[PDB]
Amino acid sequence: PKPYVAINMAELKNEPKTFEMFASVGPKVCMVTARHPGFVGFQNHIQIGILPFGNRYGGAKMDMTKESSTVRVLQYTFWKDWKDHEEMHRQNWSYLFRLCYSCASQMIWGPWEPIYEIIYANMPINTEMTDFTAVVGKKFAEGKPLDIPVISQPYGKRVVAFAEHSVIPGKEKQFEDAIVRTLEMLKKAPGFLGAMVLKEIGVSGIGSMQFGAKGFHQVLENPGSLEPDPNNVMYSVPEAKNTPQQYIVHVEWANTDALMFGMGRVLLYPELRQVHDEVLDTLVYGPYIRILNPMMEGTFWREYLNE
Amino acid sequence: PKPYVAINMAELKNEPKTFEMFASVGPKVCMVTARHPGFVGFQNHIQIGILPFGNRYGGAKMDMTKESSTVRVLQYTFWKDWKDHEEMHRQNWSYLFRLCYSCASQMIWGPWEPIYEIIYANMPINTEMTDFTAVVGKKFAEGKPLDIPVISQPYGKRVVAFAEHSVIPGKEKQFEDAIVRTLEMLKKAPGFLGAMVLKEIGVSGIGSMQFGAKGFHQVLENPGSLEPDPNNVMYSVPEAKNTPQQYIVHVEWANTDALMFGMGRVLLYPELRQVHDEVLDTLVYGPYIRILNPMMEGTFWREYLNE
Amino acid sequence: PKPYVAINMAELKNEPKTFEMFASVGPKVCMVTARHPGFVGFQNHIQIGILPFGNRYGGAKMDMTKESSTVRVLQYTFWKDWKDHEEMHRQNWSYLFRLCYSCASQMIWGPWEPIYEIIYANMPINTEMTDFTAVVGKKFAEGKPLDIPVISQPYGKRVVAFAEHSVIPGKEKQFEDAIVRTLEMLKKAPGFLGAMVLKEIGVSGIGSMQFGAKGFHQVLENPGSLEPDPNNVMYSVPEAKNTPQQYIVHVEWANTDALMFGMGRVLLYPELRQVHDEVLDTLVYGPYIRILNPMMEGTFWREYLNE
Amino acid sequence: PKPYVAINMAELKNEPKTFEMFASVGPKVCMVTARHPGFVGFQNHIQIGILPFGNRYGGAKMDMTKESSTVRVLQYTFWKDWKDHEEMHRQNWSYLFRLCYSCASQMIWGPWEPIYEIIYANMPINTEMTDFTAVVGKKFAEGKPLDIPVISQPYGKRVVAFAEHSVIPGKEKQFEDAIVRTLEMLKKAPGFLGAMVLKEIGVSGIGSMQFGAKGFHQVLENPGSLEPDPNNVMYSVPEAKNTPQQYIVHVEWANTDALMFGMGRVLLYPELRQVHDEVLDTLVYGPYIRILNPMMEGTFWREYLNE
Ligand SMILES: [Cl-]
Ligand SMILES: [Cl-]
Ligand SMILES: [Cl-]
Ligand SMILES: [Cl-]
Ligand SMILES: [Fe+3]
Ligand SMILES: [Fe+3]
Ligand SMILES: [Fe+3]
Ligand SMILES: [Fe+3]
Ligand SMILES: [Zn+2]
Ligand SMILES: [Zn+2]
Ligand SMILES: [Zn+2]
Ligand SMILES: [Zn+2]
């Protein structure tokens, strides 16, 4: 079934100490999150650059890692019910806060953790290049050659286009219909590894360290080993849902050239350009496309999705 | 009277070429904007850093200019009626688009131009250190010594705390009442040069280069000397107003230490801390405080404000 | 009214890591202390050098920062009642101990936190150079030009002479009478920014991490996240008051030259020299004068003082 | 009363030897000029750069001193009657010629010395920052707080905008009326230190070393110690007055940013822009704005002006 998705977003200093912290803290946070039976997996990204759209963002390029002073992370966690995410944070608060707070010395902005429903998904299981022979064998044995996926390699061996949009109130249905038509056509591009559309349903105050005054002071005053009051979050997830309505169109690609020219198909192929124009007409903001590297992940989230 | 404020926001590469184009393009855009009789002035900022709040943003500091790969600009233009801003962009589109588009090679994100109403203002005219003797003389001559302002020096000789907030729906009145009480007390801090509260009323699609499909293609395909269709903006300013409601609390200071400890008065002085806690209880997002340098400005906007 | 003063004293390694810790830990401690309604502010100092008194301390100079292997801090906190300080430490012990203990890797001596009553004060509110025009305007408007203070700039922009004395038992009244007469004359010196006389009333065992055996072992054995028993302090504040009676004469100055020659007025101006000789005749120890930089402060303590 | 102004203009090599000869010769010339009772003072400038007007003069900047191969000087001398200037040169010719001729090895162009009448003046006395307290005290004692000026610091501690204009024949009255209205509004800009409008009345042949054939040969053949015949000047001052009529608009500012944005007020503030447009409509040449540093001056010229 379709899980819900929480995306924890932050910006940190681009230096070795940050990546060192990622290496010790990140695995711990993942293991704590896996304590909850509603957890179905995760996919953690670092932003490597920005799609320049020709020279619309002429100061940007798809790989800015060697020049950037900051690193942006987008950590997706997948949940049977979005309420599971909220419960997980509260049940494991002593561990999670103290773990997450240890990133403090490196933080510039965040964390900010919106929650999304998946309104469209065409996403395969991941496989390594060693796996395909057995996958092919099994699918033919089962009489299901149509179920043989493209090879979508895990652990930093493919790239993601993360396309941000916000939509004019009243045009949500037009956007959703047109973006699905667009992605159904886009899947013909070489190196296409899948797509999904995430629709924001709210924001996790607890995941964003956004408390009332009491919790705010506890966070600012913290030596690192004392929890802020998790009950001091002043708003429910849906109370923070944005209008204009926000969407992420998440598309995965074999490599950055396939991404550039593949995403570009919505601009270069007349038939698809006409369809995609119906998406463009609905926007308040965007499209703004971040280029992400899915480095650390729990690939079994796609098994839940495709079961 | 209180003008409306449009704030054009963008992120560009932090390199000499960017600042060079600021120097040639910036003055031109300002002169074009001044063609409209509803224009009452401007105050252009570069972000120099971020308030770390102890080590809540421990990777940040108040002056990050020597290490940052990007520069963020926040250009305030002030208008008798916000409709004047929209009219100005459309009446002068050929010049403005071609001027603004010349920044393309340096752009990473933006432009994004929300529009604000000022719901509270305690902001003095600017004066240089050479002026105070005549100002004092004139105010005493007029029998109005209470109208003698602090010395708020123009053109990069003071600093701004730009504090971003979004508020839980239904708590807007509580936020507004508490922030005004907070700022009325905050004015006692040494080096305080004024404050105002900006409440978002919408976003300028034209100022944000956010068009329908037709205009988007025209932007992407532009050699630099052809206007997109300015009539192809698909939403009015108020249609893009955010919920949760966004506010900027803009506070000016003699220097970065006065800013750090002055803004800190809302955390360190028990009486003010209690009042400011009422603000904190209302938030979905924030406070996040950017440190800005008001470099290029048309100081006469404060003459309109205080007339 | 006159607050009481706790002065937390420590000596630490003079290296970047110490100043980095100051930057993250210091603000947190200040915010925790502000939790108590009897807290009226603070003034934190680093010692920059020692007054050489000609060549009496010929190895010393007013600014020894570039050569010294250690840095001494003197953190003043101001309290409506000295009992408020003791209550604050105990009410906020879990945060304060863990925060203060994080300074351990840098500590050479301390902390030691004597408590003082203020027996004489002539101390103005602080103002930045931008503020004076409004201050002058307001005072004249109120018909109180005599209430216009000198400009005492906050946040490291003036210097302090911290003059240590201990007095022969039985000569306390002579010392107190003579030092007040001295300071009343000293205020004529150029660049004089105020003075106060602090008389020790005791020592905070809890602030000095001075426990009985149980708490001592807990401190020595601490991983950093476990409180010693705050009830294991074996003496009350007044039980630790010193005899010979100790006093600090705290005098503020525009700059170090004004300090040197201004404090020197008590040696160089015959009329004042005769008065100051009455102070000198009472001493067991001193005068020993430390030169301090008041870097981080909550200036509103002077508002409480002068209200 | 308003004095007349002679402005001796020259261009010399930008090298130490030039500035060395400024230091020995300049004072001597000033002392000789002061022999005449009609001399009321002087204000000598070096051009430090050119106002680029955005990128209209994109090769220029306000401070070109580090890159320029030449230095332009503009030496103002002030006279009760312009005839006094002519008489002074002739009465002191042996000294002046031999002094002025010693600059020869450094000269590239000039000297050229037009004479001007002041048709508008709003110019304060100069004061150092040490003076303002006594000035304020005296003006209040006299009951004339409106006579307290801005602080216009002498000797290289402010900057001058030297704005060249020539006017269409028959439009002189329109120019003069509009420029006065403009300057009366301009005085509101922060850091404005005064303005005056100079109208050319002719050129001093003797000050410009412009003789008939006899004197020209004597100049060219001079060993440095023999006067050309001062009676060999072939034209009177008014005979050389230019048509189109030339004007200098001379505006003084606290610093180059105040100059740039202050002068810019005539382009950026719609109300002033409309008035200044009446000036622009009258021009044959200009505005061309030189940025000057008033280094060596006899400040008492402003005492004569304002008496
Ligand atoms: Cl797109
Ligand atoms: Cl805040
Ligand atoms: Cl002494
Ligand atoms: Cl001009
Ligand atoms: Fe989360
Ligand atoms: Fe705009
Ligand atoms: Fe203490
Ligand atoms: Fe002359
Ligand atoms: Zn798209
Ligand atoms: Zn706040
Ligand atoms: Zn003494
Ligand atoms: Zn002009």
From Swiss-Prot, chains A, B, C, D:
SUPFAM superfamilies: Dimeric alpha+beta barrel
Group of enzyme by EC: oxidoreductase
Keyword vocabulary terms for this entry: Cytoplasm, Iron, Metal-binding, Oxidoreductase
Listed cofactors: Fe cation
Residue numbers of Cysteine persulfide PTMs: C30
Subcellular location: Cytoplasm
Catalytically driven reaction(s): 4 sulfur + O2 + 4 H2O = 2 hydrogen sulfide + 2 sulfite + 6 H(+)
Molecular-function annotations in GO: metal ion binding; sulfur oxygenase/reductase activity
One GO CC annotation: cytoplasm
Disulfide bonds: none
The UniProt record lists the keyword Cytoplasm: yes
Induction: Aerobically induced.
Domain of life: Archaea
Cofactor stoichiometry and binding remark: Binds 1 Fe cation per subunit.
Activity regulation annotation text: Inhibited by zinc.
Annotated positions binding Fe cation: H85, H89, E113
Self-association state and partner proteins as the record states: Homoicosatetramer. The resulting structure is a hollow sphere where catalysis takes place in the inside cavity.
Name the record gives this protein: Sulfur oxygenase/reductase
